[PDB]
Amino acid sequence: PGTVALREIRRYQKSTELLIRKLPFQRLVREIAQDFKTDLRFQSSAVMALQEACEAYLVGLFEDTNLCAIHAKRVTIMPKDIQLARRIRGE
Amino acid sequence: RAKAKTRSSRAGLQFPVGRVHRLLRKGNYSERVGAGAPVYLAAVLEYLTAEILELAGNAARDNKKTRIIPRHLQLAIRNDEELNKLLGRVTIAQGGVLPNIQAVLLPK
Amino acid sequence: LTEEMLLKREERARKRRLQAARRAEEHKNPMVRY
Amino acid sequence: SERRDMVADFQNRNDIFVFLLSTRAGGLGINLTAADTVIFYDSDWNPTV
Amino acid sequence: SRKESYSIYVYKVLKQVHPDTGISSKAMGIMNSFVNDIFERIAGEASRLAHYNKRSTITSREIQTAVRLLLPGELAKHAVSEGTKAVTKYTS
Amino acid sequence: LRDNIQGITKPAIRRLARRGGVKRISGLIYEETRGVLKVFLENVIRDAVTYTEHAKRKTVTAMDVVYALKRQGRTLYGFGG
DNA sequence: CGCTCAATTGGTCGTAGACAGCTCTAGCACCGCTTAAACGCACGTACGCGCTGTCCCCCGCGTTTTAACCGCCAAGGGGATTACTCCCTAGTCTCCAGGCACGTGTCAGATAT
DNA sequence: ATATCTGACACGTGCCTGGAGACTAGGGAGTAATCCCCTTGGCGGTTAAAACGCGGGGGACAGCGCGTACGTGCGTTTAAGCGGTGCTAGAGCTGTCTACGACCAATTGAGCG
């Protein structure tokens, strides 16, 4: 079989909530803020605005990577498809 | 002096022309604001907002729903190339993505 | 039929009385051995 | 809320020797009749308080 | 104290198209964001047009031009027609 | 500890990939994505803090990040500003 | 080459959360109306650097036939999916606790009614 | 000179922000089975590649003339404060219906014949 993942696509495209676990994301946001500068602290709405921008940005990256792999006649993504998707965007 | 009423009502307009007349001067965009400019901008904002609000209500109608959510607003953008261009630099909170498949993914 | 006109009050009213009560009672109170 | 349980353990028990009060949070209406004695470590600038 | 937003006004305008329809608090925030984004676009574009003309005045023609750089499709000329109607009916 | 960005879990990155519409995912992709995810915050948190440092506040507001996202060309609705 | 079977996608019941009309309040900048500043629309008046056909050689193009390459054929074996097995940390929700702001404090000692 | 003022300067409690603890149970991480994939690599109908002989027109003038620029006139432009007072968000609270939960049917993908 090896292909019913196509039903996951349709489920997670029907769904529209945020997908990364809030605590892990908040821990990472704080860790990246705290080694950047002292005593920066985030309102919940700022962490949510960050996470929505991140996940929308990654959905864009995966759509772009999909078209790179489809263009390469693949049905699979490798890190090189992401590195094209960065250089072709200028990222 | 007379009992007050909105300047929008004489213009034929649905948004607050008075605070548009405030914003256009208070935002330091110019030294002077022409008497038509806030009426014109209210009319433009109303026209474009009503045009997308029909698509919002139609997106909910298509999904057979009665209460608008950000998903219906994302569907309203992805139902019109003018909005897909205009909002091409916009993120919609909880709006998700349009459901789509490249034919290569399909069995047979 | 007719009961729903009262249920829309009393189903909420029993909850108000209970919530008032549960608020008010806080508001008024190997190895080895040698 | 906290002002209750500390009073409820000081009244009605012999478990504690001493209590610390500010002249102005403690001074009004608490009725600590379990106490025999009082020490003003400070007197206030407003007399009779 | 008040915070400058359009919540009641967009729900007033909804009756133009869908009187049957409700709005979630989240969706109200999205449409509040839409109308002020289009303001920041047009007010900046019209001010840059006015700067290139060095004029003290903004006018119906600054915004008529700015809308044509906001949108490529005929929704621009329809919005421009709605602005010229409204300014006419206001001044008559 | 799990602080090595691996706290962004394999199935969570895979669910973002599934919403993104991609089919077979090679096992290095999760870690390549965690690399991009750091760099996106090295743009966005960094500039959002330069807006927090305009007022020099301790609290980061949703406005502070929306201004950074606006200068970085990825505007966001629902939070206002 | 079209069945039987083991599983969803989709349907009906449920239950209380999340709207949107109150139901007013009362804060305020919108709307009215004169006052007053200065430059917008008007507009000559300087005189032009886009276009109109002469003279002459430049660049693009068709044609030709090598020979690299993409589209394709099938197979190669290792790494992504489908699914079970088990370990932990995301979320709940709790109490703890402290910074920002507001307010009474008060009476002193610095300033003026 | 005197009334009494404006700091000195502190602990009152409000608000919410913000942390860490102990629990369930959602879901993440570990793994084979095995398939089916990205990938390696020969095949010849088809076009990249560059001359020779050549067509389409790029190129540099002379100067006509339908528009372009300056920058002051003069009457029409918005400015500008501050009167009244309707709109407007706060916000207090429903009064449900609407989208999201809990129990189980029509339709699909998998197995191989």
XYZ file of C-alpha atoms (C1' of nucleotides) in Angstrom:
681
model
C 0.000 0.000 0.000
C 2.479 2.711 1.227
C 0.237 5.609 0.002
C -2.799 6.242 2.355
C -0.787 9.258 3.617
C -2.882 11.001 0.851
C -5.801 10.836 3.395
C -3.611 12.622 6.016
C -3.053 15.450 3.452
C -6.836 15.977 3.144
C -7.379 15.790 6.968
C -4.612 18.324 7.829
C -5.757 20.594 4.918
C -9.401 20.443 6.300
C -7.979 21.293 9.775
C -6.841 24.935 10.384
C -5.633 25.022 14.057
C -1.936 25.426 15.072
C 0.052 22.146 14.956
C 3.231 22.593 17.109
C 2.748 21.974 20.883
C 2.369 25.341 22.672
C 4.735 24.590 25.588
C 7.672 23.395 23.338
C 7.157 26.419 21.062
C 6.930 28.851 24.023
C 10.091 27.275 25.596
C 11.968 27.681 22.287
C 10.708 31.302 21.801
C 11.853 32.210 25.342
C 15.239 30.423 25.006
C 15.956 32.260 21.684
C 14.847 35.567 23.284
C 16.869 35.104 26.529
C 20.242 34.275 24.864
C 19.556 37.270 22.527
C 18.777 39.854 25.358
C 18.050 40.067 29.155
C 14.526 40.210 30.753
C 12.488 40.018 27.498
C 9.106 38.371 28.411
C 6.207 37.537 26.058
C 2.451 38.099 26.238
C 0.552 34.916 25.168
C -0.778 36.858 22.122
C 2.831 37.626 21.019
C 3.816 33.906 21.263
C 0.643 33.050 19.282
C 1.384 35.739 16.642
C 4.928 34.265 16.386
C 3.649 30.653 16.113
C 0.976 31.517 13.487
C 3.626 33.352 11.405
C 6.047 30.370 11.819
C 3.540 27.659 10.848
C 2.153 29.690 7.898
C 5.796 30.255 6.804
C 6.576 26.485 7.058
C 3.346 25.559 5.143
C 4.638 27.934 2.420
C 8.097 26.250 2.535
C 6.503 22.767 2.222
C 4.268 23.902 -0.718
C 7.419 25.341 -2.406
C 9.383 22.127 -1.637
C 6.486 20.061 -3.086
C 6.712 21.962 -6.387
C 10.553 21.549 -6.424
C 10.224 17.736 -5.962
C 7.336 17.498 -8.505
C 9.545 19.494 -10.920
C 12.443 17.054 -10.217
C 9.977 14.191 -11.224
C 10.096 12.846 -7.591
C 7.303 11.827 -5.168
C 9.732 12.360 -2.184
C 11.443 15.356 -0.499
C 15.177 15.390 0.462
C 17.030 18.330 2.201
C 18.328 19.376 -1.287
C 14.706 20.158 -2.371
C 14.512 22.575 0.640
C 17.921 24.095 -0.303
C 16.626 24.764 -3.837
C 13.379 26.173 -2.315
C 15.582 28.595 -0.268
C 17.994 29.641 -3.086
C 15.151 30.031 -5.675
C 13.306 32.314 -3.151
C 16.655 34.054 -2.305
C 16.380 32.927 1.390
C -26.461 75.193 15.415
C -28.567 72.045 14.776
C -29.122 68.466 16.098
C -26.157 66.421 14.833
C -26.169 63.641 12.154
C -23.302 61.784 10.367
C -21.672 63.435 7.259
C -21.543 59.895 5.775
C -25.406 60.003 5.487
C -25.278 62.979 2.998
C -22.352 61.337 1.128
C -24.368 58.029 0.877
C -21.758 56.182 3.005
C -21.652 53.425 5.643
C -18.297 54.065 7.517
C -17.346 57.058 9.805
C -16.157 59.837 7.382
C -15.413 62.131 10.383
C -12.646 59.935 11.876
C -11.268 59.300 8.352
C -11.021 63.144 8.072
C -9.204 63.007 11.473
C -6.812 60.146 10.496
C -5.790 61.691 7.125
C -4.584 64.899 8.939
C -3.429 63.371 12.306
C -1.251 60.713 10.544
C 0.865 63.623 9.060
C 0.204 62.449 5.432
C -0.201 66.141 4.299
C -0.596 69.753 5.580
C -4.167 69.995 4.073
C -7.027 67.504 3.363
C -9.409 68.240 0.417
C -13.153 68.225 1.306
C -13.795 65.075 -0.837
C -10.732 62.996 0.248
C -12.143 61.378 3.498
C -15.543 60.766 1.809
C -13.668 59.179 -1.131
C -11.506 56.986 1.157
C -14.532 55.877 3.220
C -16.294 54.997 -0.088
C -13.208 53.020 -1.316
C -12.838 51.127 2.003
C -16.611 50.386 2.068
C -16.710 49.264 -1.605
C -13.752 46.860 -1.231
C -14.939 45.596 2.208
C -18.508 44.943 0.935
C -17.062 43.134 -2.137
C -15.016 40.740 0.123
C -17.884 40.437 2.692
C -20.126 38.954 -0.043
C -17.386 36.352 -0.721
C -17.149 35.709 3.063
C -20.925 35.095 3.323
C -20.829 33.017 0.105
C -17.883 30.952 1.498
C -19.967 30.198 4.627
C -23.043 29.473 2.390
C -20.912 27.036 0.305
C -19.933 25.170 3.522
C -23.677 25.488 4.577
C -22.754 27.532 7.735
C -24.337 30.683 9.325
C -21.513 32.122 11.566
C -18.322 33.446 9.857
C -14.910 32.069 10.997
C -11.349 32.823 9.617
C -11.623 29.722 7.342
C -14.531 31.362 5.416
C -12.380 34.524 5.134
C -9.415 32.500 3.729
C -11.876 30.823 1.272
C -13.122 34.331 0.294
C -9.504 35.318 -0.624
C -8.841 32.046 -2.553
C -12.126 32.444 -4.525
C -10.886 35.704 -6.238
C -7.581 36.487 -8.038
C -7.894 40.203 -7.070
C -7.917 39.162 -3.387
C -5.276 36.437 -3.964
C -3.063 39.298 -5.341
C -4.106 42.022 -2.826
C -3.756 39.705 0.233
C -0.711 37.812 -1.223
C 1.429 39.389 1.604
C -1.193 38.601 4.352
C -1.437 35.855 7.016
C -4.970 34.924 8.248
C -4.974 33.592 11.838
C -6.562 30.057 11.923
C -7.505 30.441 8.173
C -5.381 27.416 7.085
C -4.554 26.692 3.390
C -6.746 25.899 0.336
C -7.034 22.044 0.043
C -5.047 21.018 -3.071
C -3.234 17.971 -4.592
C -0.708 17.709 -7.469
C -1.907 14.809 -9.712
C 1.438 12.913 -9.226
C 0.378 12.036 -5.615
C -2.703 10.029 -6.785
C -2.749 6.168 -7.134
C -2.842 4.859 -10.785
C -43.445 21.313 24.873
C -44.335 23.840 27.692
C -41.553 22.629 30.077
C -38.661 24.100 27.960
C -39.851 27.684 28.734
C -39.118 26.872 32.422
C -36.040 24.598 31.788
C -34.278 27.572 30.085
C -34.477 29.220 33.580
C -34.353 26.341 36.109
C -31.489 24.325 34.485
C -29.343 27.492 34.845
C -30.826 28.458 38.268
C -29.848 25.087 39.904
C -26.302 25.732 38.543
C -26.285 29.348 39.948
C -27.328 28.049 43.420
C -24.641 25.319 43.306
C -21.878 27.699 42.060
C -22.906 30.262 44.717
C -22.696 27.481 47.373
C -19.235 26.090 46.375
C -17.885 29.675 46.117
C -19.498 30.798 49.408
C -18.083 27.835 51.440
C -14.539 28.875 50.355
C -15.544 32.551 50.828
C -16.621 31.658 54.472
C -13.679 29.292 55.301
C 17.383 -2.675 47.832
C 19.734 -2.142 50.877
C 21.873 -4.637 52.840
C 21.347 -4.237 56.644
C 23.652 -4.649 59.656
C -7.637 34.324 52.151
C -4.188 33.854 53.842
C -5.256 36.155 56.764
C -7.761 33.421 57.830
C -5.712 30.224 58.214
C -2.863 31.890 60.195
C -5.462 33.298 62.675
C -7.331 29.948 62.723
C -4.048 28.168 63.687
C -3.104 30.851 66.303
C -6.529 30.943 67.963
C -7.786 27.485 69.095
C -4.229 25.942 69.350
C -1.240 26.038 71.731
C 1.131 25.091 68.813
C 2.623 28.625 68.295
C 4.512 31.014 70.651
C 4.538 34.290 68.678
C 2.921 36.271 65.809
C 4.367 39.155 63.672
C 2.024 42.034 62.711
C 2.363 45.377 61.013
C 0.770 48.150 63.130
C -1.750 48.804 60.282
C -2.663 45.419 58.701
C -2.849 43.715 62.145
C -4.118 46.608 64.304
C -7.879 46.417 63.440
C -10.503 43.916 64.699
C -8.600 40.545 64.549
C -9.214 39.771 68.300
C -6.197 37.455 68.988
C -7.353 36.683 72.610
C -5.074 33.607 72.586
C -2.239 36.170 73.175
C -1.312 37.082 76.794
C 1.330 39.716 75.928
C 2.373 42.284 73.282
C 5.689 43.852 72.163
C 5.722 47.045 70.104
C 9.084 46.750 68.410
C 8.029 50.128 66.915
C 5.663 52.905 67.996
C 3.841 54.792 65.165
C 4.229 58.544 64.286
C 0.405 58.830 64.710
C -0.173 58.391 68.514
C -2.901 56.118 69.999
C -2.718 53.833 66.895
C -10.597 53.974 27.082
C -11.462 53.441 23.334
C -8.861 51.777 20.962
C -9.780 52.889 17.348
C -11.460 49.908 15.509
C -14.394 49.048 13.149
C -16.187 46.065 14.856
C -19.785 47.442 14.832
C -19.302 49.142 11.418
C -18.244 45.967 9.514
C -21.225 44.122 11.109
C -23.480 47.065 10.004
C -22.095 46.693 6.420
C -22.691 42.865 6.444
C -26.481 43.576 6.079
C -25.699 44.853 2.521
C -25.081 41.189 1.442
C -25.932 38.572 4.158
C -28.515 39.680 6.836
C -28.815 35.937 7.769
C -25.119 35.716 8.814
C -23.298 35.971 12.204
C -19.572 36.870 12.810
C -17.192 35.029 15.223
C -14.998 37.278 17.456
C -11.916 35.920 15.582
C -13.432 36.748 12.158
C -14.371 40.247 13.444
C -10.651 40.763 14.272
C -9.622 39.607 10.742
C -12.009 42.125 9.077
C -10.927 44.876 11.524
C -7.346 44.081 10.343
C -8.355 44.201 6.655
C -9.885 47.716 6.668
C -6.890 49.294 8.516
C -4.304 47.510 6.273
C -6.039 49.010 3.173
C -5.926 52.409 4.980
C -2.123 52.079 5.634
C -1.605 51.138 1.933
C -3.735 53.971 0.468
C -2.682 56.734 2.930
C 1.027 55.923 2.294
C 0.573 55.675 -1.524
C -1.477 58.928 -1.717
C 1.087 60.725 0.537
C 4.010 59.494 -1.675
C 2.061 60.680 -4.770
C 1.513 64.063 -2.994
C 5.274 64.191 -2.095
C 6.241 63.566 -5.780
C 3.899 66.516 -6.657
C 5.236 68.549 -3.584
C 1.585 69.578 -2.790
C 0.263 70.656 0.649
C -3.158 69.059 -0.206
C -4.408 65.502 -0.511
C -7.420 65.330 -2.868
C -9.846 62.931 -4.614
C -7.190 62.591 -7.418
C -4.377 61.452 -5.046
C -6.592 58.538 -3.837
C -8.062 57.867 -7.340
C -4.424 57.298 -8.445
C -3.408 55.364 -5.264
C -6.330 52.870 -5.698
C -5.030 52.139 -9.255
C -1.698 51.028 -7.657
C -3.580 49.056 -4.913
C -5.506 46.838 -7.425
C -4.940 45.871 -11.130
C -8.555 44.647 -11.800
C -11.729 46.698 -12.471
C -12.637 46.686 -8.735
C -10.234 49.700 -8.783
C -12.422 51.634 -11.335
C -15.614 50.579 -9.475
C -14.184 51.831 -6.124
C -13.030 55.043 -7.963
C -16.596 55.377 -9.342
C -18.007 54.914 -5.795
C -15.617 57.607 -4.413
C -16.549 60.111 -7.182
C -20.309 59.398 -6.567
C -19.945 59.916 -2.797
C -17.895 63.170 -3.053
C -20.418 64.475 -5.630
C -23.490 63.610 -3.461
C -21.782 65.038 -0.331
C -21.002 68.416 -2.023
C -24.401 68.813 -3.874
C 16.741 17.722 28.386
C 15.314 18.202 24.817
C 16.424 21.838 24.156
C 18.313 20.942 20.887
C 15.159 22.114 18.900
C 14.173 18.370 18.806
C 11.322 19.540 21.139
C 9.711 20.542 17.795
C 8.574 16.913 17.390
C 8.910 14.674 14.276
C 5.101 14.125 13.912
C 4.405 17.885 14.411
C 6.846 18.802 11.567
C 5.348 15.927 9.524
C 1.797 17.340 10.153
C 2.965 20.780 8.907
C 4.414 18.915 5.889
C 1.032 17.104 5.367
C -0.904 20.451 5.507
C 1.772 21.688 3.022
C 0.677 18.790 0.715
C 4.040 16.873 0.479
C 4.122 13.027 0.054
C 7.217 10.886 1.042
C 9.450 12.691 3.659
C 13.164 11.696 4.004
C 14.407 11.342 7.644
C 16.825 14.354 7.470
C 13.940 16.794 6.538
C 12.738 17.231 10.153
C 16.198 18.505 11.208
C 16.608 20.667 8.056
C 13.193 22.221 8.937
C 14.346 22.867 12.570
C 17.292 24.787 11.023
C 14.875 27.022 9.027
C 12.600 27.383 12.107
C 15.499 28.791 14.231
C 16.520 31.221 11.438
C 12.918 32.491 11.103
C 12.994 33.488 14.835
C 16.557 34.943 14.347
C 14.745 37.328 11.946
C 11.356 37.758 13.671
C 12.079 37.704 17.476
C 15.235 39.803 16.887
C 13.386 42.575 14.974
C 10.304 42.287 17.282
C 12.693 42.986 20.200
C 13.976 46.067 18.263
C 10.325 47.298 18.395
C 10.051 46.293 22.108
C 13.332 48.308 22.501
C 11.617 51.326 20.834
C 9.561 51.698 24.064
C 12.248 49.684 26.055
C 9.467 47.545 27.667
C 9.872 44.176 29.486
C 6.636 42.841 27.846
C 6.718 41.902 24.145
C 3.274 42.830 22.695
C 1.529 41.343 19.627
C 2.099 44.830 18.063
C 5.914 44.507 18.467
C 6.005 41.256 16.441
C 3.411 42.519 13.881
C 5.724 45.516 13.156
C 8.703 43.142 12.618
C 6.524 40.884 10.397
C 5.381 44.041 8.468
C 8.998 45.194 7.736
C 9.866 41.538 6.854
C 6.925 41.441 4.333
C 4.737 38.760 6.090
C 1.824 40.814 7.540
C -0.668 39.178 9.987
C -4.401 39.791 10.718
C -6.582 39.149 13.854
C -4.128 40.651 16.410
C -4.672 44.214 14.975
C -1.957 46.910 14.473
C -10.703 -7.244 -12.667
C -14.611 -8.355 -9.022
C -15.934 -10.110 -5.079
C -15.315 -10.084 1.198
C -13.410 -8.049 4.460
C -11.547 -4.525 7.894
C -11.944 0.291 8.447
C -13.220 5.465 7.657
C -16.194 9.613 6.122
C -20.122 11.050 6.984
C -24.849 11.157 9.613
C -28.059 12.060 14.128
C -28.196 13.211 18.923
C -26.261 16.307 22.795
C -25.054 20.215 25.696
C -23.283 24.418 27.023
C -20.273 27.534 25.221
C -19.730 32.068 22.506
C -22.102 34.925 20.345
C -24.887 39.656 19.227
C -29.239 42.376 20.838
C -30.050 44.639 24.320
C -29.665 48.279 28.182
C -28.185 51.829 29.110
C -23.942 54.972 30.464
C -21.359 59.208 29.949
C -16.753 60.492 27.295
C -15.775 62.882 23.869
C -14.461 64.375 18.879
C -17.823 64.620 15.463
C -20.740 68.176 13.200
C -21.881 73.684 12.874
C -20.619 77.862 12.517
C -17.785 81.908 11.928
C -12.673 83.631 11.351
C -8.854 84.184 9.065
C -4.337 82.307 6.630
C -2.044 81.714 2.310
C -1.638 79.641 -1.617
C -4.626 76.603 -5.985
C -6.036 77.085 -10.078
C -5.122 79.870 -13.439
C -1.833 80.747 -17.402
C 0.948 83.719 -19.791
C 5.261 83.241 -21.816
C 10.032 81.318 -22.642
C 11.090 78.895 -26.998
C 12.144 72.577 -27.549
C 14.280 67.698 -27.953
C 10.419 64.395 -29.757
C 9.708 62.886 -34.430
C 9.894 63.531 -40.072
C 12.606 61.289 -44.143
C 18.047 60.950 -46.192
C 22.515 57.993 -46.902
C 25.186 53.350 -45.687
C 26.658 49.369 -43.917
C 25.475 46.037 -39.540
C 22.919 41.632 -37.331
C 19.784 38.145 -37.874
C 18.525 34.728 -40.191
C 17.915 30.494 -43.084
C 20.337 26.331 -44.189
C 23.160 22.245 -43.086
C 24.623 17.831 -40.807
C 27.288 16.400 -36.590
C 26.629 14.401 -32.011
C 25.012 15.661 -26.844
C 21.062 14.861 -24.608
C 16.247 14.137 -22.616
C 12.555 10.884 -22.654
C 12.286 6.356 -21.957
C 12.976 1.006 -20.862
C 13.737 -2.144 -16.972
C 15.974 -3.542 -12.992
C 18.692 -2.471 -8.403
C 18.498 -2.983 -2.730
C 17.786 0.467 1.094
C 15.031 3.763 3.386
C 9.734 5.807 4.027
C 5.515 4.222 4.936
C 1.915 1.310 7.869
C 1.322 -0.442 11.833
C 2.385 -2.325 16.684
C 4.806 -1.582 20.875
C 5.832 1.391 25.617
C 7.633 5.708 27.776
C 7.356 10.461 28.701
C 5.884 15.363 28.700
C 1.853 18.626 26.964
C -1.838 20.197 28.928
C -4.719 20.979 33.268
C -5.231 23.729 37.222
C -3.407 24.462 41.067
C -1.208 27.638 44.629
C 2.677 30.607 45.091
C 4.601 35.154 44.694
C 5.963 39.744 42.832
C 6.035 43.970 39.565
C 3.016 47.973 38.189
C -0.301 50.977 39.502
C -3.261 53.246 42.471
C -4.262 55.062 46.803
C -4.033 56.708 51.908
C -0.330 58.043 54.641
C 1.702 61.972 57.462
C 3.796 65.174 58.898
C 8.045 67.527 57.915
C 10.707 70.890 56.143
C 11.142 73.204 52.401
C 8.019 77.605 49.933
C 5.214 80.861 49.701
C -0.509 83.001 50.564
C 4.347 86.179 60.768
C 1.373 82.934 59.420
C -1.918 79.584 57.250
C -0.936 75.601 54.935
C 1.292 73.615 51.224
C 4.331 69.637 48.407
C 7.322 66.458 49.248
C 9.151 62.021 51.427
C 9.216 57.332 51.225
C 6.549 54.774 53.606
C 2.819 49.765 53.414
C -2.520 49.615 52.036
C -4.632 45.953 48.256
C -5.974 46.094 43.506
C -4.698 44.119 38.921
C -2.288 40.556 35.939
C 1.923 38.420 34.867
C 4.433 34.746 35.486
C 6.606 29.986 37.768
C 6.690 25.271 39.215
C 4.471 21.270 40.999
C 1.634 16.479 40.515
C -1.751 14.397 37.849
C -3.639 12.035 33.500
C -3.415 10.191 28.977
C -2.264 12.096 24.335
C 1.271 11.253 21.481
C 5.845 10.917 20.671
C 9.781 7.735 19.890
C 11.457 2.828 18.774
C 10.932 -1.008 15.427
C 10.045 -4.613 11.650
C 7.953 -5.887 7.178
C 8.320 -4.974 2.837
C 7.488 -2.585 -0.826
C 8.252 0.491 -4.038
C 11.680 4.492 -4.904
C 15.244 7.512 -6.138
C 18.288 6.347 -8.698
C 21.910 4.205 -12.036
C 22.523 3.786 -16.908
C 22.109 2.267 -22.551
C 19.104 3.771 -26.502
C 19.289 6.917 -31.565
C 14.533 10.383 -33.182
C 15.365 14.586 -32.386
C 17.191 19.530 -31.835
C 21.766 22.644 -29.738
C 25.797 23.958 -31.897
C 28.323 26.918 -35.419
C 29.695 28.724 -40.758
C 28.343 30.838 -45.593
C 25.510 33.834 -48.191
C 22.303 36.754 -47.434
C 17.526 39.754 -46.041
C 15.728 42.862 -42.662
C 16.731 46.903 -40.820
C 20.124 49.247 -37.055
C 22.373 53.171 -37.261
C 23.769 58.981 -37.330
C 21.980 63.100 -39.209
C 19.494 67.936 -40.122
C 15.758 70.733 -38.474
C 10.413 71.147 -38.176
C 7.352 72.173 -34.809
C 2.720 70.227 -30.754
C 4.406 70.281 -26.480
C 7.150 71.034 -22.671
C 8.968 73.631 -19.057
C 9.057 78.466 -15.426
C 6.945 81.128 -11.539
C 3.478 85.192 -10.808
C -1.717 86.551 -10.780
C -5.984 86.750 -8.196
C -9.921 84.498 -6.372
C -10.839 80.376 -4.702
C -8.762 76.687 -1.430
C -8.412 74.634 3.278
C -7.083 76.246 7.884
C -8.493 77.106 12.483
C -11.020 77.119 17.332
C -14.531 75.830 19.991
C -19.963 76.009 20.516
C -23.439 71.884 20.914
C -24.586 66.896 21.460
C -25.146 61.780 18.846
C -22.191 58.536 18.385
C -19.693 55.255 20.368
C -17.350 51.103 23.462
C -17.704 49.753 27.738
C -19.566 46.417 29.668
C -23.152 43.896 32.190
C -26.025 40.012 30.899
C -28.585 37.263 28.915
C -30.910 33.574 25.946
C -30.301 30.655 23.473
C -28.231 28.088 18.248
C -24.623 27.158 16.565
C -20.418 24.829 15.991
C -18.218 21.394 18.210
C -18.614 16.664 21.124
C -20.530 11.292 21.546
C -22.698 6.813 19.207
C -22.756 4.192 14.749
C -24.250 3.913 9.404
C -22.691 4.016 3.301
C -18.691 3.910 0.974
C -13.774 3.092 0.313
C -8.887 0.587 -0.043
C -6.653 -3.715 0.390
C -6.149 -8.814 -1.079
C -5.177 -11.816 -5.292
C -7.438 -14.414 -7.984
